[PDB]
Amino acid sequence: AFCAPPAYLTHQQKVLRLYKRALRHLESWCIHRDKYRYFACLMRARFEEHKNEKDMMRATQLLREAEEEFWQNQHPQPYIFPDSPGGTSFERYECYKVPEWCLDYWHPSEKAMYPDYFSKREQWKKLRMESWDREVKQLQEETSPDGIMTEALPPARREGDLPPLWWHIVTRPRERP
Amino acid sequence: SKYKPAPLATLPSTLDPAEYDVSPETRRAQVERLSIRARLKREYLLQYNDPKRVSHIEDPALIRWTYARSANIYPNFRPTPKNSLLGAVAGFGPLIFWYYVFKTDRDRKERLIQEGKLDRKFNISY
Amino acid sequence: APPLTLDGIKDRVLYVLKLYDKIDPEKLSVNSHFMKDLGLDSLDQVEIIMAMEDEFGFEIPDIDAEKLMCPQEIVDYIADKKDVYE
Amino acid sequence: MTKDMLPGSYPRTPEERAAAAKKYNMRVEDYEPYPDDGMGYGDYPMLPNRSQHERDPWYQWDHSELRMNWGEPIHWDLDMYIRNRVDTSPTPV
Amino acid sequence: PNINRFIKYLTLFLITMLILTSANNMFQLFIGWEGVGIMSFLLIGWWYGRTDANTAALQAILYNRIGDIGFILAMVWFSLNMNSWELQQIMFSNNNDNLIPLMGLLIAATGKSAQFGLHPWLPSAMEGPTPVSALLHSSTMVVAGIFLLVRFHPLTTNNNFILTT
Amino acid sequence: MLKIILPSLMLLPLTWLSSPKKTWTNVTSYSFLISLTSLTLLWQTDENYKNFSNMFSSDPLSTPLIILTAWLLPLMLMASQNHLKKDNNVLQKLYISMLISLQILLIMTFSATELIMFYILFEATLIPTLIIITRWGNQTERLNAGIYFLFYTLIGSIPLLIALILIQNHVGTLNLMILSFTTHTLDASWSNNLLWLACMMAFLIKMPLYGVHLWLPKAHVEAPIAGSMILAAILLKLGSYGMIRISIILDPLTKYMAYPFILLSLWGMIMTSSICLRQTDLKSLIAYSSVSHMALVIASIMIQTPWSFMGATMLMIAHGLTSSLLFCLANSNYERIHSRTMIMARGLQMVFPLMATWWLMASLANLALPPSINLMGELFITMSLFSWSNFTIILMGINIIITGMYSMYMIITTQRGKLTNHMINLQPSHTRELTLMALHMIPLILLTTSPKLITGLTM
Amino acid sequence: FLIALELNNLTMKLSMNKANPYSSFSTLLGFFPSIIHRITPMKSLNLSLKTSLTL
Amino acid sequence: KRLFVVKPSLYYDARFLRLMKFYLMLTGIPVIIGITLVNIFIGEAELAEIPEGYIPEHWEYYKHPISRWIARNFY
Amino acid sequence: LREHWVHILVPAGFVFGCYLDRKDDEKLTAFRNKSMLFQRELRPNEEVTWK
Amino acid sequence: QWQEDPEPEDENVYAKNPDFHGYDSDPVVDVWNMRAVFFFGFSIVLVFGTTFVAYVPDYRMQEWARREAERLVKYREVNGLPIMESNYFDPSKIQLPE
Amino acid sequence: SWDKDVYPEPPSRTPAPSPQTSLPNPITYLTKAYDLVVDWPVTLVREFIERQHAKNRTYYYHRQYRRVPDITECKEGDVLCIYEAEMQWRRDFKVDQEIMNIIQERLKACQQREGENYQQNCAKELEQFTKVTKAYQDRYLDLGAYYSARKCLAKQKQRMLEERKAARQE
């Protein structure tokens, strides 16, 4: 979620990802932990086996074969963590994640009940404004002369500088509001 | 065995022959797409995080979509044999079908009231 | 459940690693790299993250799992995910 | 918003194809108009029929619910493919 | 945080379930019949930021409006062939041929009780909070269709086509 | 009626002679006090209609419509008050004048005792309405919407003028009571078939009937808020009120001449309802919702049964309040993000919890939740349509299913899911916006407790 | 109950579990949702746009 | 530790509801008390037989005092 | 009274309207106490059945 | 290009007046406009208008017709007459075609 | 009160209690306590009201509507006489709606009380319903929404002719 994806997965990434998928599905069939441990070690035997085959034209043919084998022995209903995509708690609290900007419409009589939270907030709104100009400038200075771009972002290279485009990450609502 | 796709059950990314393509021509396609993606993502962020913003972030992609689906349909419509038949059938097809259902039903109903063969026994509201 | 605190996360991350066999506890610190100071391979670090997800009860996406290469990085990824700030 | 930032008529020349692609933020080799049967599409891109359930769930999409990014071209049938409706994801069977 | 809206909705469901069960005429049945339909929508979709809750809630509504056709079919028939919606007056229909009204009630019961053909919406309603699942989608709302056909049992006893179905 | 009309004529001098800082308060205060006086019409203790003079007279059909008109004027003033705050003074007073003029004509239109007087008033409403849509509309398409609205009506209305003149050249008068008590059966000759269409197409266009309805989604999608409120709540019901009034003198040709129009309404309503599923514009989704409700009103009037008339009158009043409430709610978002796209703003229940309650109640009225009078109409129209023929239940069954989908899909899309958090200009709902919704919803709830008041002529 | 005990006590055996058509049908609700909730809404919503609104 | 909860400005929804209830009750409660004392004390007219010769006033054909009083004066 | 006089405009209209309806009645008395349904003998101090 | 104003910006109506009601930019004119709508809209019309409609008597003879039907259903039952005749108009008065 | 001839009601025949168990009927206790705590205080409040309604006793009458010439006595076009014949018929037609409701109340009131013997002990009320329905259908059915006296008369004449043509053959 935090890291933007690359342009394309390498062979190394496509095999590790399969490895994790194939174990999680094994655990879905086995259930029992002792039985899940036994077959998880057999699974690693099948991945250590062709670990070094560096043909790079049969390694691929060993992956498409293994994905087509995974897709046939899927669990029709794998276990999912409650907060993960497809999970039962997935996005349960998204109705409680009010953006911080909604406080900017609060009535004064509402703001009068939290005088010290609302004072540590005008500092953050100042810090955000003074930092903005220097953030925009830094992002042009690192705009590579060749258009090739990636979703990643640069840090603060100086002192007294916050990393550019930091407000929507730092201020984001809590995972469990 | 083997998985046969369909429009409502597409092909998994991991079973796609064209997803294990690594020839340099594809990899360059996949790197320009990301560059176009990142260029836009950068521009959206430079508005989302802007502190002097006071309104929402207008979306040209959404304006184009809604305009393509209303104000731009008719100018880009040309009559053809397939359109004209489709509109003729779509237009009057259902209307003729129902006409005979109702007309046939109500003729059987008017026939059975002249010969008294109906049981309107407790019916006093219509 | 009780709130997660930065030290409690740190203690549970190492605790899971100390029960791993291919790691040798005597040389296992928070800064231990998993591929250089401990000599674990790719196919192990995948199982290490899987062991963290079970420990803590939530998933780490693969785009992020493949960069958690030292106990501190894991501890900080969990801490930032669960809004733990001290 | 001006006439050349908005959808237009079907692109007849390759010079008006690369103009259309640039409008919609696509690669020229990716831009593909709907077939010219005069059903009213004009030059709006024909995009693969994948519902939004298939989009990377873990990515931080700009339009979070739609699983789109700001600026990206929107499928003609988006409102049929939102996550509340038709799902075209792969099935185990 | 909104616990006492959640309490209020459960109370409203109870009221629309007591309206349904003690009704003396089809129209007042329909108030509870449709009322629990709405109250189910709001509680199944309690976590309205969750997209799968909203899809499960609209799915419950869609199947229960397919069974509304059956209820409305039966209602029109009785107001035309018996001049009444009251259960007392409907009783003197015991010697008619109640195929059309009883097919309507069987379709309404099929949808409201999640019978084969209109059944997916019940396992899908489990999105909502567990107190909702216990109260509505197991021990009250789902028996409405069975309850309906118990009301009209004096008519279904003389129809073998309806019984056999 | 001259005690409902003359005070209303005085809101025009009062608009112009009031102070700049008092125009909106003064006029909206006296509009309420005028809709109170119109309740006197409801004092109907007998089976004889109120005949006030040779000009005006009120019936159980023209009284609900008269009152709904008078009550809607104060509602539209409050609706138009925030999007006109940037106009100079004479433009506001000129906008208030065009809205008052539309209330005065509409009241005279429903109280008229003669068809020719009805026609002229029924045509005069184009002027203030064309001015509103075009002068104060927002997009460039408002010019093409004024033409579509003006000439659909006028083309239909010229044959009606011809037919009304033929009726008087033969009967001697156009008085509605006399034509009722002296009506002679028409022969089934090919000339009377055309007289029937002449007398009907004017009103069938204004409903609108399916096929000839493209003026309505154009007009609504571009009118200012008070333009849509009056259009969806009263001007469509000019068609229904006319057909009921003039169909007495058209028998027995309605037993067969109506088939083409029962079929366009019954099939047409399914076409329009299914459109609302794929309509990308929120103000457009409601406008097609109106077309599919008026379909039942057309179908029920064409069969002339005591139940069908009763259901249509209830659905006319119910739709009047409900469609107006929806347009006001869609406007409330639009006056914040200035976009009509339905999917652009989402999860609005998170920041407008109370306005999300009105959305739910409006949406529940639209899908005709019992015991609201929206259902009573739909239910009594179904009952009559079933007796007319039993297979109409097939098409009304479908339309009821689709009506649930696009009503909740409207609510689920805009009020639920995640908030579109970039919309930092989502200000808290105004006290004015909330009062506007309470004024729509409270009468609708009150009329459910006393349905007797909107049963029409037959019941 | 007796049949269940035997069946659920084979899951303790160190023998791998495999898919069969009968358990896939059980686990996937007889495929009634996977078909009816995909084909039916597609055709109807596709008609809503291509036929009614556009054509 | 207690954490701040970001919420929408609820002051305005609450303000409207209070104001709506104030004016509804401002005359509703006086009316209710008025309607309730009229039923408690004046009561509803009883049904009788038109004595021969007497011609009832138009308003003497309704029961409720509130309707008889409105009828007598304004209609 | 140079910015509040406008409040007799509408109240005057109502009063003028009520009076204008009282004339419409005075013009339509051709069948007063002559209907087959309500015609009766005039009471002692009764000059007209209705006004 | 042509001389033309730039588009006016997105103002916050609550920025300067936190008690803005929605009616006017001036606070004093604004509150009295809210007050008028609530008074004439809710205290006067909805309350009195609802009351005046609840005490309209014998509305459309719904009450007289019941009182009269009971009188007729009694009179006819004791005197042995049918509760309701098949023919409305007496057959004596109707001269049919021969 | 109400007229027991308009709304006939068989007298109640409650068997006298026969308690042959030693235990106490919990119904009969909460019924006593209900009478003392609920019934008794309420009856005082009602007796107070009816002593006010006695001090301000007011009367209202049922309106008499003499009979006017029928529609059959109206020359065609004379709207003055058609109007009164039309108003009378609408009054008559409305009283017939309420007669039907009364006959329906009885049938519904009998169905409930007879309970499991409605198929046998509700014959007389089902017979009046079946008879008063045939009359209603012979007067008002199929008239339409624009029903009136003249259509009622036209429907009757068309039926008196279709029956005269029964004996003209038989």
Ligand SMILES: CCCCCCCCCCCCO[C@@H]1O[C@H](CO)[C@@H](O[C@H]2O[C@H](CO)[C@@H](O)[C@H](O)[C@H]2O)[C@H](O)[C@H]1O
């Ligand atoms: C049957 C109902 C009655 C219909 C009545 C017809 C009313 C006239 C409708 C046509 C519109 C009148 O035209 C209207 O003129 C006024 C001033 O006269 C203009 O008013 C505006 O512009 C002019 C200068 O441009 C300024 O003097 C004025 O203060 C400003 O508000 C409007 O911009 C224009 O729309």
Ligand SMILES: CCCCCCCCCCCCO[C@@H]1O[C@H](CO)[C@@H](O[C@H]2O[C@H](CO)[C@@H](O)[C@H](O)[C@H]2O)[C@H](O)[C@H]1O
């Ligand atoms: C059964 C009876 C019903 C009969 C109804 C007949 C109604 C007649 C309506 C007249 C419409 C006139 O329509 C007039 O021309 C077209 C119609 O597309 C509109 O023009 C619009 O489309 C045309 C395409 O042809 C474009 O050139 C133009 O830029 C665009 O604005 C005009 O803006 C409108 O003024």
Ligand SMILES: CCCCCCCCCCCCO[C@@H]1O[C@H](CO)[C@@H](O[C@H]2O[C@H](CO)[C@@H](O)[C@H](O)[C@H]2O)[C@H](O)[C@H]1O
């Ligand atoms: C597209 C617009 C459609 C136009 C619709 C106009 C309405 C149609 C009106 C019905 C058709 C004309 O109706 C016509 O009426 C006239 C008198 O009025 C009669 O026609 C006849 O009138 C008199 C006898 O009455 C004869 O002397 C004359 O020679 C002949 O014209 C017939 O009744 C019919 O021919």
Ligand SMILES: CCCCCCCCCCCCO[C@@H]1O[C@H](CO)[C@@H](O[C@H]2O[C@H](CO)[C@@H](O)[C@H](O)[C@H]2O)[C@H](O)[C@H]1O
């Ligand atoms: C629209 C808003 C609502 C406003 C409604 C106002 C209604 C007011 C109701 C009060 C009615 C008073 O009506 C009054 O009733 C009393 C019975 O008590 C009767 O009065 C009669 O008996 C009383 C008993 O002492 C004598 O004092 C009195 O002299 C005599 O006329 C009359 O019929 C009428 O004078």
